[PDB]
Structures are given as C-alpha cells and as structure tokens.
Design an enzyme around this catalytic site. Structure first.
Site, short mmCIF file in Angstrom:
data_model
loop_
_atom_site.label_atom_id
_atom_site.label_comp_id
_atom_site.label_asym_id
_atom_site.label_seq_id
_atom_site.Cartn_x
_atom_site.Cartn_y
_atom_site.Cartn_z
N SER A 25 0.93 -1.06 0.00
CA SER A 25 -0.06 0.12 -0.09
C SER A 25 0.85 1.33 -0.01
CB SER A 25 -0.99 -0.09 1.24
OG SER A 25 -2.00 1.10 1.01
N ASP A 72 -11.31 -1.73 -4.82
CA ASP A 72 -10.41 -0.57 -4.17
C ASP A 72 -10.36 0.62 -5.13
OD1 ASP A 72 -8.32 0.52 -3.27
OD2 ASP A 72 -6.96 -1.33 -3.23
N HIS A 100 -8.84 -3.28 -0.61
CA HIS A 100 -7.55 -3.05 -0.27
C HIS A 100 -7.15 -3.53 1.08
CE1 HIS A 100 -4.44 0.06 -0.78
NE2 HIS A 100 -4.32 0.21 0.47
#
Length: 343
Positions: free
Chosen positions: A177, A281, A311
C-alpha cells in the site's frame, strides 16, 4: 503506438467468501474516525489479531534471529529490524536480501505490522529481511518518508554483511500500500544512483499501492481511472479516505515524482515487477496504470488480480482462505524475483 490495458470481471462485486466475513466485521460508529483512532485500531485490533492468527505458523526460535538497528537519517535516527535465517549448520552463510516497506497510508505503522510475516518469510525463503520505521505523516510531510525508506535501502545494501546478507545473491524491494508507493519511488531513485551500481535491485514486489496524486493524474489517462468513483465507498478504503491521506502527506508539489511515482520521466530499466491488486479498491486503476506503463517501458512484469475483495483485506481478515492464498502468492512472487539470482 498504444499499450495493453487490464479491464474488468465484476472486480467490485463482493467475492462470495468475503461478503459474510464483511457482514460480521465490527465497524466504529464514527462517521470518520480521527487519525489517533486509526493508529490505535492498528495497534489494538489489527496487529494483535493478525499475530494471534499467525502465531502457530511461526518458525521454531532456533531457525531465525532478529537484529535491531538505529541508523542515521536526515535529522534523526530510524529503527531498522533485520530477520536472519539461522537453520543452516553454517553460521557464516550469507543470504539474499529482502527490503520490506510497511503499509499505513503514510500516516500509520511501523515494523510491528509485518513482523510475524517476515519471521515466516525469512525462514521459508532463506533470505534476510529488513523492515524500517520510516517517518509518518502528517507530523513529517512528503518526501520525508520516502527519503527515510531510501536511506534505509542504502544502509541495508552497504551493511548487508553485518547481518549475513549479500545483495549480489538477490536484492528484492517489496512494499504494501503506501509502503509500496514509497518503494516505487525508491526503485526509480536507486536505478539512477551510482551508489547502487555494484548492488542493484534485482526485483520488486508491490501490493495495491497509490501511484499518483489525483490532482496530478495526466489528462490523457484520466479516462482509465474508473475505480476511484466506482469503488468510492469500498470496504476498508473509500475515495474520501484516499484524498484525506494525500492531504495529510502534504507534498509541496503533487506532480513531483518524489510523491507521485507514476510521473517519473522514465520507467525503463526498473527491476522486474510483481504487482498484486485488489479488485474492490478505489486505488485499483492507478496501480493498473502504473503497471501498464512499466510493462510498456520494457520491464519484465507479472500481475495478479484478486477480484471482489477490498484494499488490504488480507491484513484484516488473514483467517480467510482467500487471504492466506494472497499471502502465499506474495511469497511465490518473492520466490520468482529471487529466482533471477538463484542460490
């Protein structure tokens, strides 16, 4: 000419295994929890529950050791943890080098997030792993976090031997991420930096990273970005939250590649890239775009898409069989990258 594009398959329709799990997830009553509550949630719920699930999969304590360091960065010191395999009868053996950048929207987290996972991986792959506590937003603005990640990468390359690592045996950078975003920045920087000439990165793995500030998305690609609106209310990460994390990071120039790695002038000659995407996402399509641009620049590339899950679902719901498969495929992508300098 043009380039290829990864399009659909009901990417944002709930995976049948995820819908019931999501239905039981406790959600806070706050319309928008403040930063301190999000940090506390990771500290009190996400990491403790992840570690409780992973505890029976940890290797025996004889099979790895941990070494903590405190290294200088611009204006302060940074904690670094190394994960060193110790199952070989040869205590002088050196291993390939994995440099891991944790998640958290640039505003949350430290080595604790992935500590158990890296204990497992260092034993499973026989590599030395490195995890670093880069400075968080909003207390430090971009590009402070990226510069810390880079300083740590330089330290790990130059000091590898002191924790039984040798980047000539393999040198893979990996990030999750926001940490994947910082590693994308670091990989471009390292490509251009003669410091790394003798110990170049040999591979890169990222999971669902942000790649570009919305205000700096190139006009010609704005049509490609469907996920930000289509998934604006997706579980675990909303469009509103994406914009808030960008605001907390407060880059002086959102068009600069030190914040938006999509916007580096060149994506040629980057390490081979293993890219992992979640279908449900808002950040999905800027990641798919970044992957497309890297592929069109001639870099070897693999993509894995998990449709119908949000996510970071594997960090919050690791007990799902699907989440375990996500982690297994993470490790398989690492193994692919390390197979390019096989030991």
């Amino acid at each position: 000419m043009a380039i290829t594009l990864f399009l659909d398959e009901g990417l944002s329709t709930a995976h049948p295994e995820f819908a019931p799990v999501w239905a039981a997830f406790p959600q806070p009553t706050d319309p928008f929890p403040p930063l301190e509550a999000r940090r506390a949630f990771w500290d009190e719920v996400v990491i403790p529950n992840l570690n409780k699930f992973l505890e029976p999969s940890l290797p025996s304590e004889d099979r790895y050791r941990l070494e903590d360091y405190y290294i200088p960065v611009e204006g302060t010191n940074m904690h670094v943890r190394t994960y060193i395999p110790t199952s070989s009868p040869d205590k002088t053996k050196t291993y390939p080098l994995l440099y891991w950048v944790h998640c958290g929207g640039w505003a949350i987290g430290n080595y604790e997030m992935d500590d158990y996972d890296l204990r497992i991986i260092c034993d499973k792959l026989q590599v030395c792993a490195v995890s670093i506590d880069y400075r968080l937003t909003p207390e430090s603005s971009s590009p402070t976090g990226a510069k810390d990640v880079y300083a740590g990468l330089k330290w790990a390359a130059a000091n590898a031997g002191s924790f039984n690592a040798d980047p000539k045996k393999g040198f893979v950078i990996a990030g999750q991420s926001a940490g994947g975003n910082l590693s994308l920045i670091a990989a471009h920087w390292a490509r251009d930096d003669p410091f790394f000439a003798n110990t170049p990165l040999t591979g890169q793995l990222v999971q669902y990273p942000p790649t570009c500030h919305p205000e700096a998305m190139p006009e010609e690609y704005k049509s490609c970005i469907k996920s930000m609106e289509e998934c604006r209310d997706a579980p675990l990460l909303s469009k509103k939250e994406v914009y808030w994390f960008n605001e907390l990071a407060n880059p002086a120039d959102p068009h600069d590649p030190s914040f938006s790695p999509l916007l580096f002038p060149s994506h040629a000659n980057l390490p081979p890239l293993f890219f992992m995407s979640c279908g449900w996402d808002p950040l999905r399509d800027e990641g798919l775009l970044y992957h497309a641009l890297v592929k069109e620049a001639g870099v070897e590339t693999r993509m894995t898409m998990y449709p119908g899950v949000p996510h970071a679902f594997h960090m919050l719901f690791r007990s799902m069989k699907l989440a375990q498969k996500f982690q297994e495929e993470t490790i398989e992508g690492m193994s692919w990258l390390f197979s390019k300098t096989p030991q």
